[PDB]
């Protein structure tokens, strides 16, 4: 929750599970950050498209 | 006759150069309006095709 970053806490949980279990093992895959980057990607596409469009329109 | 049509092409090519000479600046803004357009056309076509490649 919190809007909290996926990049954080997983390392906290990393040591956490490295503790509650005697050895690192959980080997979990990262969340949300992939959503973060794909969001940046799609919005980036919005940037390219909308910007070139609007520039062309200004040229109009 | 097509003789006066092609002679029309080149002689009114000269007449065109003169009419543009009447407004080189207007001609400039006009042609630029063309240029940015088509250049952007081929631009986006090629780049999109390339990224697609």
> Is residue A49 classed exposed, middle or buried when 0-12, 13-18 and 19+ CB atoms within 10 A define those classes?
exposed
Q: Which of A14, A34, A9, A11 is nearest to A25 (CA)?
A: A14
Task: Choose from B31, B34, B36 for mutation: most chain A CBs within 10 A.
Answer: B36
Q: Are A33 and A4 in contact (CB under 8 A)?
A: no
Please report the residues numbered 1 through 60 in chain A whose beta carbons come closer than 8 angstroms to any beta carbon of chain B: 52, 56, 59-60
Resolution of the PDB structure in angstroms:
5.3
Distance CA B21, CA B19 (A): 5
CA atoms within 13 A on the CB side of B15: 6
DSSP state of A30: P
Instruction: State how far the alpha carbon of A28 is from the alpha carbons of A22, A23, A24, A36, A41, in Å.
Output: 16, 14, 10, 18, 24
Measured between alpha carbons, how far is residue B39 from residues A7, A15, A60 in Å? 43, 56, 14
Q: Which two tokens stand for residue A57?
A: 């329109």
* Dist. CA B34–CA B22, nearest whole Å: 19
Half-sphere exposure (CA, 13 Å, Cβ side) for B51?
5
Contact status, residue A56 vs residue B37, Cβ threshold 8 Å: yes
Question: What distance in Å separates residue A37's CA from the closest CA in chain B?
Answer: 19
Question: By what method was this entry solved?
Answer: cryo-EM
Could you tell me if B40 and A56 are in contact, meaning their C-beta atoms sit under 8 angstroms apart? yes
3-state secondary structure of A2: coil
Structure tokens at B47: 């780049």
For CA atoms B9, B12, B17, B23, the dihedral sign is: negative
């Amino acid at each position: 929750k919190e809007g909290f970053d996926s990049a954080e806490a997983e390392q906290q949980l990393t040591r956490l599970l490295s503790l509650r279990h005697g050895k690192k093992d959980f080997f979990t895959w990262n969340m949300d950050g992939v959503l973060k980057t794909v969001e940046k990607t799609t919005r980036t596409l919005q940037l390219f498209l909308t910007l070139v469009a609007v520039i062309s329109l200004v040229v109009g | 006759g097509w003789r006066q049509f092609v002679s029309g092409f080149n002689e009114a090519l000269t007449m065109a150069w003169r009419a543009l000479a009447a407004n080189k600046m207007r001609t400039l803004l006009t042609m630029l309006g063309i240029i940015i357009g088509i250049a952007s056309v081929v631009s986006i076509v090629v780049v999109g095709d390339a990224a697609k490649q």
